Amino acid sequence: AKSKNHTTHNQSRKWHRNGIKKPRSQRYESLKGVDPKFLRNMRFAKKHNKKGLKKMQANNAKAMSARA
RNA sequence: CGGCUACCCACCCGACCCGUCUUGAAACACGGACCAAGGAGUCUAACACGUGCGCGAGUCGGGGGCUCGCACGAAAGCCGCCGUGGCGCAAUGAAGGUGAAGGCCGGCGCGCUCGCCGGCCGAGGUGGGAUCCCGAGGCCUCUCCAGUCCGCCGAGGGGCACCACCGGCCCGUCUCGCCCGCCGCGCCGGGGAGGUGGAGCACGAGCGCACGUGUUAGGACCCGAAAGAUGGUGAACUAUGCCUGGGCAGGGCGAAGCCAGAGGAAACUCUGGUGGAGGUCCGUAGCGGUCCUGACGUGCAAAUCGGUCGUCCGACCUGGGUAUAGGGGCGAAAGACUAAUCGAACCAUCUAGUAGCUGGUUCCCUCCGAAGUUUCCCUCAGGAUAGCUGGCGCUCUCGCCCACGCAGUUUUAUCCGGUAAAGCGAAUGAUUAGAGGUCUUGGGGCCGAAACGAUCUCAACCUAUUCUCAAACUUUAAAUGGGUAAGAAGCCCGGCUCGCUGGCGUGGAGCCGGGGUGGAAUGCGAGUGCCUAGUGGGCCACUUUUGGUAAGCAGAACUGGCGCUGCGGGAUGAACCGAACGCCGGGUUAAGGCGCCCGAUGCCGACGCUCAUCAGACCCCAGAAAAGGUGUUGGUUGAUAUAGACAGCAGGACGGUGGCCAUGGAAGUCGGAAUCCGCUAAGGAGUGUGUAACAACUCACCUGCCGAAUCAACUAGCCCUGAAAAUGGAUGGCGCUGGAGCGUCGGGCCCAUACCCGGCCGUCGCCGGCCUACGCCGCGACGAGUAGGAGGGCCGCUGCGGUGAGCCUUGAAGCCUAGGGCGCGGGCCCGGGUGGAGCCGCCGCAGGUGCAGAUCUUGGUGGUAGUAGCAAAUAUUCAAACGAGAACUUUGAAGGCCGAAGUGGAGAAGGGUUCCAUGUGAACAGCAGUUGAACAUGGGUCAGUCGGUCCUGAGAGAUGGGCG
RNA sequence: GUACCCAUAUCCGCAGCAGGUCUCCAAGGUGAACAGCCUCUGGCAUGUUGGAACAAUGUAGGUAAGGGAAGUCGGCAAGC
RNA sequence: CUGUUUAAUUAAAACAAAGCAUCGCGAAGGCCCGCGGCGGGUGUUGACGCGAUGUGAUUUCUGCCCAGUGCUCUGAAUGUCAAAGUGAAGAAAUUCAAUGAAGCGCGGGUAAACGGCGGGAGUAACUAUGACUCUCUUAAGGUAGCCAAAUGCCUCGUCAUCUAAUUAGUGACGCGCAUGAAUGGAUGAACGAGAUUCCCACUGUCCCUACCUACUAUCCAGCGAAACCACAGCCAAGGGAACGGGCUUGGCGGAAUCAGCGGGGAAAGAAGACCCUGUUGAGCUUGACUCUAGUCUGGCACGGUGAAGAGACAUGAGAGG
RNA sequence: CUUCUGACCUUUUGGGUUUUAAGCAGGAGGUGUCAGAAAAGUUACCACAGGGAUAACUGGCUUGUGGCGGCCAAGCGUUCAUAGCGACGUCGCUUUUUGAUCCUUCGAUGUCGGCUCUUCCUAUCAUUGUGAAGCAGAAUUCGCCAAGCGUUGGAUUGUUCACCCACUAAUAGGGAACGUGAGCUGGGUUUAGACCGUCGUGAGACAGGUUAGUUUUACCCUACUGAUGAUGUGUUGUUGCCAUGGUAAUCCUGCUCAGUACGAGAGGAACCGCAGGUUCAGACAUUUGGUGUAUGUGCUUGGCUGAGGAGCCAAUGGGGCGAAGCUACCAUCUGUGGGAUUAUGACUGAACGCCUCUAAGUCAGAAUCCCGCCCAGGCGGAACGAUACGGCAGCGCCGCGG
């Protein structure tokens, strides 16, 4: 009652029935896995960007609109 | 005259019998004699998904109540202070419990890696994002002027659905830190900043109804078992006890006891009768069954018969009553018997037990369409998961110098490898041979008391070489192959934030604003979500390989095919070569072929090879080698020949020297070593034959005649030998030799469902029109397919509600039909005939809804087939009679059998009118009948003294009592 | 209760089935015998069919010149 | 020995048998039945009886081992050993400690209980064979007997006899794979429908077949089924699921039949009795797992009165190293 | 599930305290069949559902192995390789042994051997014709054409195989599903009974040994043997051909040749001719032997017809003979030759001045082959005869018109 054990015949033809797909697109890539000390940098940097970017960038926009 | 047609026949070509298990079916695999009816995926509950409807942060009366007593009303209508309740709107924790809003501006405490007060907005931001809005500008018969008008658009803005990321809030644990409050200051509560797990929030989409698919539990697609339990029925067969009865022909052997006689001293012994003993011998009835493995062996019989048998006074055979009843009984023990069943009886119930295991599974058309593979399982005939597949969609993109993106592809750059190869005078492992050198010990020899005092030889070592390799060696290193990049998600500039880092505004990440998109080739319109069947036994072929001697063997890699697949060649074929399939007309071709089958060379085809007394005839493919050929055709290497060869004829073939090693010979001639000179025309210290040797013969060599080409060794094309198998046979056969064989080719010719054009059907994509919009057109590309999945059916059957002022006793359903027709098809309509009372079309609804199979169930009917068979036991014959009718009925007569253990006269059990008479002969008696045990009618059984009734036998049994 | 069968045709075996089922009575001859054979009383039509011929093969019975087990696993069967 | 046995494949070398023995039991008992009772069989019985066993007449015999598995007896002398009871800790549940019935072990017996019975080397005036002797080892080491047997793989062992010829028979030899003593050994008159070899007579078993009779088979009168059947039946070769009838290429092929014969139809009769698979069973067996009837014990109630003796705990006094 | 560790943790159900219990998080106790059930054996008394997914027969591929050939030749063969052989190597054939695979067969293909019977192959044992020897003759050995015909009786074993005796020209090798069981036999293998020896505690097992152990059916089709018949010639009869199918003859002994050739002897032929004999085939019964129911004759046993005579029955009562018929290698007769040729030996004669059996031509040439002889004669054809009264008929030749 010996049977055929293992083969990879008729496998690439099944693979190319659907055109094997790259993930091909991740705009603004996934962030998990990166260094937790770098995350402790980046989250506080982002929320203080939300806090204190207003007036200096506003005056810089006024200055660059006056210059050009 | 015309007619396709379920009519019949002939002709050319193709054509194995369907269904399934299978890699493979026409199979020497299985089911199927034929026909009619029935026959197999239903229903409930639960879940999930998709679709349609109503209401919608709600939804639902399914539970009851209200109406007057209504056939349809077991319907329907309503409740609302009947919403109790289910699901959802809130999750997280094991739990105590806790529980989803933030952002902007101004002020203060040292705007402190830090909390508070006042006002405003309100489910955040980034990049995409259908759509929408604004708009420079352009364009409509001659000028200024205009309003709607014809009319797009660079660029800009707000940004649904969803995608990707960041940030925020809730709960539980973890880390670090400070503050607040007091119906009471405590091992009391709450709050902050980070990293976490959750099926969460971040403007909610559910509930109910119905349909479709899938899964699960239920008998559950249909049929199927060996088995288990529960409760009853059997000792009329058989097994064994017990009671009660019955039976067993004749002979042979001759025990105990008894009588008489004889011998002896006694003890005692011997002889002739008599007697009838015995789990005794031959043998009958009876009981069993050894052998012929006889006859049957669809028989007389689901165990019998004929011979030959064993035993037959007994451990003998047997009737009736009774007792032992199923995991029990009984067993002179065979697991044998227990009602044709016994290694656990029979009947019913659980039960339609379960089966991963055989078989079957019912209308058509269209579209798409596999796999025998990964992993896991007490897994290997199975299942789960992933892959392959189908269906349902959603998000976008195009139609009006440039788009988003993708690829079994190439190129341009960039890396990666360790196989093929090659090498080992390169590491490792093997392995061959020679040379040189002198350090060293081991064995021989010389100078010689001995001495590395000197030297010859040998071994090992070293040096430079050289021979051959290595899947588990490698300096080097291919071809093929794999990854990445070829832009707006990319560059450049300027600036903020950081609690990361730190000489530094140093670096790095994030955030904000702006500038220019023409950045390899070719082709293609893309992304994404849900549900699910089948599959999980494979095989073959080129190339690379593992094991094996090899296999149509077993196991791997890439690709293709079969499976799942037709068609043209290979005669015949699963895989080979072409080439893939809707129905046809024309033309062309591939693979192949052109002597006849058999379409096409029947060309004044070309070149050359081949004789077989076993020719040869085209990948897989259906047979063959080493070796050999003065059989022929080329080719290479050479050597001879006018200073006349090759073959032919003729002549010579000596001297030293009978040399040397030998003596059984050698005086060239078995053998061992050699090898010259003279005469020369030339002789080889001799190529062979012999006479044992001594001698004759012959050859190399030489010369006379002849006359110009000759000889040798290899090589490869055809052919031959090598080449032997059983049924008679295979280039397919027939035949084929100036080819119809072989190798090279030229021009034509033939066709497949292949290709091009055209007609028709269908599917798909795009689209047209304000003509059943679910209809009507238009263009273009394609149609194959088992398992499986969808869509359509104005295919069909049954019944239900609407509906056709439907149909008809002037003929409905059903059935038959060499008739007419439609649709590709499921099927349908009409014509003709039997028939006599119900039937149909459309729209919705619900099925016990379609048959070729299942050793399918029931019923009927063929071939066999007027066949086998009416043959165990000796046998009938003549005349007459009743009678339509006599081999069979009856009588006379003749001949036989049973022959007293009967083929006779009567009984017990069992049968129940079969007993008797009359009448009929369809029915039964396996032919027949006037006959019978058949049929119909009418009769027949008389008891104090025959038996039961009475009695107990083995035993069965109730009360008293005990147990339950 | 009293008929009848009590059986190769009235029972059982699916049947007018070479199967099975318990008993009494028993003649003459030959013969030891209730053995086998032929007769008597008493029954019967040969056992679910008849006619014609006598082929192969078969089923039962009998023989065969000479050898006597040489055949066959075995003297199996048959015969003394 | 006579007898019995697998009805429907065995008739025996199988079973039974008398004889030989063994064990349990003196009745409140042995062996058993029963769901139950002091219910029943043995038992209308009492060791010359009942029940369970091995072997199987007569003669001669009954070798040696209790190491193992069994069976039995004994001592609370001593380890282990469950309920119930005693004491201590605590508020109690609970925990701990000693006390220790059966059984196991410790000790003895038993083999006419289950069973078992050795392999090495050197040795005698030719060679061999080899009593004797050394050594490992067990519990004992096969004794009296017997043999290529119904028991011997090699093996058709060797020798002798029967025959012309023998894998057959008979007799002997015996380190005998793997004979053997109630697992009974060795003989053994009579009897085997038991198995085998040889001899005389006898015959068709044959050489070597032939003939005759009865019945059937043949035909006719009457009456007449059954199995089986996808279709139906001419062969050779090739291919194919590797042996076809139907495919291909050849050989070819006349209607309808009768009597036979068995080459074929991989003929029919049965869902292979052989092999394997099933997470399918069933008879069994035991030192497989898990239970239980029965049975041996301890405790608790029925279960009560009197005396004597002993053990342990607690109290006080005296001796004691 | 158990155990341990940690929080001054949660719940211990109406409220508090304590013990206990449960939970939370992580370490261990283990699933070796290692992603994990807790598990001995037998069934020859076996059963069920399946499988040729999977063995035991054949058949199919291969030929390791077996068997049978070839190649070069160191040597054996007194000398001498190839008369006969041939070491070491090497190339092949076959499925007559065995092995390998599982392709078919599990809803069955009846599995060994023997008997009987038919056909085929040659790798030839003998016979016919041949060549070569270390072939003097005789007897052998090696090859070729060659399968036409033969290739025994027996003691043993179930035997296949194997050994032995005797005869003979010789006792050659095989195939046909390891030919053949709806042909037989059942001897063993291979059911159930049982015994011995070994293993196992035991049920039981033993390619260890010995006994007893059911062999079912043809009437279907085809094939084959035999017998009717069918088609066209108008019917029918007689006399005849053979196209085709088959094939039949084989072998040995004795006498002359001849005690001759040959050989020193020992020994010892051949050709023709003559008597025969073995096997096979066809017959036939005059004789012989069988059979015998002309139930023919004649005895005799037991019974029966009253006794004699005549008889009858006893499954043809017995046996003595026995006519006709069937039969026996148990009696007797018969079995027949022409051609082309294979192997081989040659002639003439080149290639290649010569040689040569060959390349074209020729000759001889055998159990091989074909034909004759002999069997049945074709969907084959001939020649000839009669060819339908009766009282009306009916039927043929010539030439006819519709």
Ligand SMILES: [Mg+2]
């Ligand atoms: Mg597989």
Ligand SMILES: [Mg+2]
């Ligand atoms: Mg398939």
Ligand SMILES: [Mg+2]
């Ligand atoms: Mg198969």
Ligand SMILES: [Mg+2]
């Ligand atoms: Mg098929």
Ligand SMILES: [Mg+2]
């Ligand atoms: Mg079959």
Ligand SMILES: [Mg+2]
């Ligand atoms: Mg079939």
Ligand SMILES: [Mg+2]
């Ligand atoms: Mg069938």
Ligand SMILES: [Mg+2]
């Ligand atoms: Mg139907």
Ligand SMILES: [Mg+2]
């Ligand atoms: Mg929904």
Ligand SMILES: [Mg+2]
């Ligand atoms: Mg509520």
Ligand SMILES: [Mg+2]
């Ligand atoms: Mg059970």
Ligand SMILES: [Mg+2]
């Ligand atoms: Mg019961």
Ligand SMILES: [Mg+2]
């Ligand atoms: Mg009785």
Ligand SMILES: [Mg+2]
């Ligand atoms: Mg008995």
Ligand SMILES: [Mg+2]
């Ligand atoms: Mg007696």
Ligand SMILES: [Mg+2]
């Ligand atoms: Mg006697």
